[PDB]
Design a protein around this motif. Structure first.
Motif, PDB file in Angstrom:
ATOM      1  N   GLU A 115       2.664   4.094   3.657  1.00 52.81           N
ATOM      2  CA  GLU A 115       3.344   5.182   3.461  1.00 52.81           C
ATOM      3  C   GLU A 115       4.706   4.967   3.890  1.00 52.81           C
ATOM      4  N   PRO A 118       7.813  10.208   9.177  1.00 46.59           N
ATOM      5  CA  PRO A 118       7.462  10.117   7.874  1.00 46.59           C
ATOM      6  C   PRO A 118       8.459  10.823   7.018  1.00 46.59           C
ATOM      7  N   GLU A 143       7.314   0.614   5.348  1.00 51.40           N
ATOM      8  CA  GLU A 143       6.068   0.862   5.072  1.00 51.40           C
ATOM      9  C   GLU A 143       5.023   0.897   6.396  1.00 51.40           C
ATOM     10  N   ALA A 144       4.575   2.085   6.756  1.00 50.89           N
ATOM     11  CA  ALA A 144       3.860   2.262   7.741  1.00 50.89           C
ATOM     12  C   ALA A 144       2.709   1.392   8.087  1.00 50.89           C
ATOM     13  N   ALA A 172       0.828   4.567  10.904  1.00 50.05           N
ATOM     14  CA  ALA A 172       0.075   5.576   9.732  1.00 50.05           C
ATOM     15  C   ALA A 172      -0.863   6.459  10.813  1.00 50.05           C
ATOM     16  N   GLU A 173      -1.559   6.033  11.493  1.00 48.16           N
ATOM     17  CA  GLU A 173      -2.525   6.814  12.021  1.00 48.16           C
ATOM     18  C   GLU A 173      -2.084   7.753  13.029  1.00 48.16           C
ATOM     19  N   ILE A 183      -0.822   9.642   8.219  1.00 47.26           N
ATOM     20  CA  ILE A 183      -0.321   9.644   6.687  1.00 47.26           C
ATOM     21  C   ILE A 183      -1.195   8.475   6.318  1.00 47.26           C
ATOM     22  N   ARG A 184      -1.143   8.045   5.088  1.00 46.85           N
ATOM     23  CA  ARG A 184      -1.763   6.912   4.650  1.00 46.85           C
ATOM     24  C   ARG A 184      -0.994   5.674   5.043  1.00 46.85           C
ATOM     25  N   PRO A 185      -1.945   4.442   5.460  1.00 48.23           N
ATOM     26  CA  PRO A 185      -1.037   3.205   5.954  1.00 48.23           C
ATOM     27  C   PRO A 185      -0.371   2.829   4.635  1.00 48.23           C
TER      28      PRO A 185
END
Lengths: 245, 245
Positions: free
Chosen positions: A125, A149, A110-111, A116-117, A121-123
């Motif tokens: 994700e 991703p 999970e990022a 994520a930034e 993408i959404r944290p």
């Protein structure tokens, strides 16, 4: 991994002598006693002159103080263009003259907020995280952690970077295979003390500084891969060649 | 200027807690005694776990040990293209949002072996050496020493970089004024402890690391300017944007 101040005057004179070759590497710096007499300075001034040169990394201890031999740096050539054959190694080191290898390990995650930034993408994700150790003729000289991703690579033949029909051929080739055209790359070069895990893998001592490239590949404005690329600052420089228009 | 080892296991756990925010900046690291009891380790193991985190620059002293607040880095944007208006500052920091100033000092010199080589001229051949201190809104944040072969600029209106009709407009504009078309730039980013003179000007402490860009401008294959550009590694990163073809 998987009127100048006295001590600056004195220090300046010895530094020049060091650059001259007057004080060649592996030669002892004049002693505290010798500095005091030769320059007619107080003990503290002689002491502080020596500390300047040590903080500057020009001299070291090993019963006296020795002029350090600073190695000629090697270049890690950075480029966005296509090579001979594409690999993760050649992607990081564009210098064709360098024959290199890698070991890697890939696993989902999970990022984090930070990753994520960088990938927009959404944290939380999911991403594919792959770590590399790169060797130059058997010698480890570069580390990297790469995140992609799964939104882009999930359920495709290039989901695992070092597997499948274009495995081991790098990000731009692997992305092109899934109709994703990487057109830009941003690279930010920073420096920091290496992590123990990095320094142990790279063969440096605790506190040793590394250069860290934060690299993000883009396809049509969207991030498709981000990475932290790590090289030892004492041995390497990050080399760019830019057009002037 | 003008089975992991115990101490890595323990250190790893605290490092994670530091990245978590579990141990926020300015918060004391658990004590030696607390680490020994909580993790059931020897005194030396607790001690060595702490040394890892300090060599890594994650914690510091200031009666206990404190998680360091590491500042968000700012980018020094590197580019070969033309800006609003050209200046030596804008040449080093392409980021248009940054309003910046400089002080400089220019004087001739005989080229050292190292500078002679970067400029592809005979050692001892004369150059114009100009030193810059650059400020971002009053704050000094970048240093530079630039050398130009008098073979190129001697007896021209652009001989002195910060004087004449195109003074203060940077290398590419000054060169163009004398029919010399800069078409390429090489930049190699390294890192090293700052020189006392640099660190004193930049406001860092002895031993503080700087990023050093060795930059050389080319016109039709010939070097027309070479420079060492210096920024504090704790505050800045050197940012490149490359095409992918």
């Amino acid at each position: 991994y998987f009127e100048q101040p006295a001590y600056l005057r004195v220090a300046g004179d010895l530094r020049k002598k060091i650059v001259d070759g007057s004080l060649p590497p592996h030669t002892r710096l004049p002693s505290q006693a010798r500095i005091r007499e030769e320059y007619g300075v107080s003990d503290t001034v002689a002491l502080e002159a020596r500390k300047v040169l040590m903080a500057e990394g020009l001299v070291e201890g090993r019963s006296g103080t020795y002029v350090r031999e600073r190695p000629v740096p090697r270049r890690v050539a950075r480029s966005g263009y296509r090579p001979s054959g594409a690999t993760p190694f050649r992607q990081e080191q564009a210098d064709g003259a360098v024959r290199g290898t890698w070991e890697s390990h890939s696993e989902q995650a999970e990022a984090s907020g930070a990753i994520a930034e960088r990938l927009d993408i959404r944290p939380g994700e999911r991403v594919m995280c792959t770590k590399y150790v790169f060797r130059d003729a058997g010698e480890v000289m570069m580390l990297s952690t790469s995140w992609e991703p799964l939104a882009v690579t999930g359920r495709t033949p290039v989901m695992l970077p070092e597997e499948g029909p274009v495995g081991g051929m790098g990000v731009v080739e692997r992305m092109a295979a899934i109709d994703v055209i990487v057109d830009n790359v941003t690279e930010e070069v920073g420096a920091r003390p290496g992590l123990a895990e990095e320094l142990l893998t790279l063969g440096g001592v605790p506190g040793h500084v590394v250069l860290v490239i934060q690299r993000t590949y883009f396809a049509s404005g969207r991030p498709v891969e981000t990475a932290d690329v790590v090289v030892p600052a004492d041995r390497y420089r990050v080399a760019y060649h830019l057009p002037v228009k």
